[PDB]
Amino acid sequence: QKIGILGAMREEITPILELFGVDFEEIPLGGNVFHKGVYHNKEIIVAYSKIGKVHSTLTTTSMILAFGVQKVLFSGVAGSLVKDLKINDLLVATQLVQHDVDLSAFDHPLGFIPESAIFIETSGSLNALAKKIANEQHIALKEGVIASGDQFVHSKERKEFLVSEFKASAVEMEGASVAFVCQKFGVPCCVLRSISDNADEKAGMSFDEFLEKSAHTSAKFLKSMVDEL
Amino acid sequence: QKIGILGAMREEITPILELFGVDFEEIPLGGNVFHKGVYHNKEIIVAYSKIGKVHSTLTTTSMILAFGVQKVLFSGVAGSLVKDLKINDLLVATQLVQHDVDLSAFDHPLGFIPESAIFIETSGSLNALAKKIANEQHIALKEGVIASGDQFVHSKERKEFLVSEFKASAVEMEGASVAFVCQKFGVPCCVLRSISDNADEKAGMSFDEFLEKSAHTSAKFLKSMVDEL
Ligand SMILES: Nc1ncnc2[nH]cnc12
């Protein structure tokens, strides 16, 4: 079995590497470093993509094409758009959208690109596994919509748009693109996020305070999933 | 020699296929169809990515990793931001930026992502070849900055931003991402565009009228470059 494990930032994968605690071979490709290891009879390939849609699309495509991963699990932090997602809370993305896509010049719905779709789906099986683990461990786990775009959201106005247009529960910058690539190649994908901020005027300061802890919370949960695979 | 040739839309590569006039093998991968042919001792791989940064990043990465292309030439249409770029006029991108990238929440310059750069460069050699061909054929060819983003621009306000923030000459939705992937893999890249509209309130109607002709103008020029490779 071969499992790809992705984060966007070094801070998001550092706890992943430490938690698995095995020897990793570092393999450079396409401006990324892939960490290849063996964990309980499974080959794991771990990398951070760097932030945003282009970075994450590239890295996910490399993972699939060059490393032959059979599933991709993403772990990282996100901004909350809903009251019931507090700092540190976990969410699994059931659907994702590229919230900054706009071809309204041609009267297309926002988020829509011709020959594509507004929403991208993730793995029913992996999401179901996540919910079972959360329940067993007495952890709250929201199953909902993630909006992804190439802006770090820090305004009430944009939050209101994401909630009204897309019914999004959280916002980040890589989930939709990772899930998109996985779907195009027929690779099961799960996107996990822990909340670092409220995507408002104070989002940057909140993110700075909570990045480490939220990154660890997500990583620890991802590890618990791999332990059941 | 192996050359990748990319457009974003079917309309942008149809004239490319027709102009080369050779037999193509159709090969599906990652939601794209790659057209593989032989033209004067060179293997050419032609595809359209579909619109936008995620689509084009995926396709370019597939071209490089799965097909082993040694250079990538992009051809398509774009919106003009400058008076001296009229409908049908050609531009080669010397530098490109992702104009919709915004991490100002952390006081980063617009267009900047940590561990990256605002501007992406293209092939000095290919751009120089393009200028020589244009000169020899009495064709105007601007060498300038392209701004790429996941919105089809159709407002004076956004045009003013692109010109002031990035000194952009044209706007489109794939150039920066294609060039970005090529640079990460050390693959020479040239991005060619023909103007279809003025990126203003009437951009959609202009695009509809001029897509076919502008797409052909770009394709014909791209072919003339390949004829010198
Ligand atoms: N507010 C926010 N916007 C985008 N990505 C984020 N990741 C964490 N917080 C975020």
Ligand SMILES: Nc1ncnc2[nH]cnc12
């Ligand atoms: N106005 C515009 N905005 C973005 N991409 C374009 N391609 C052609 N015209 C465009």
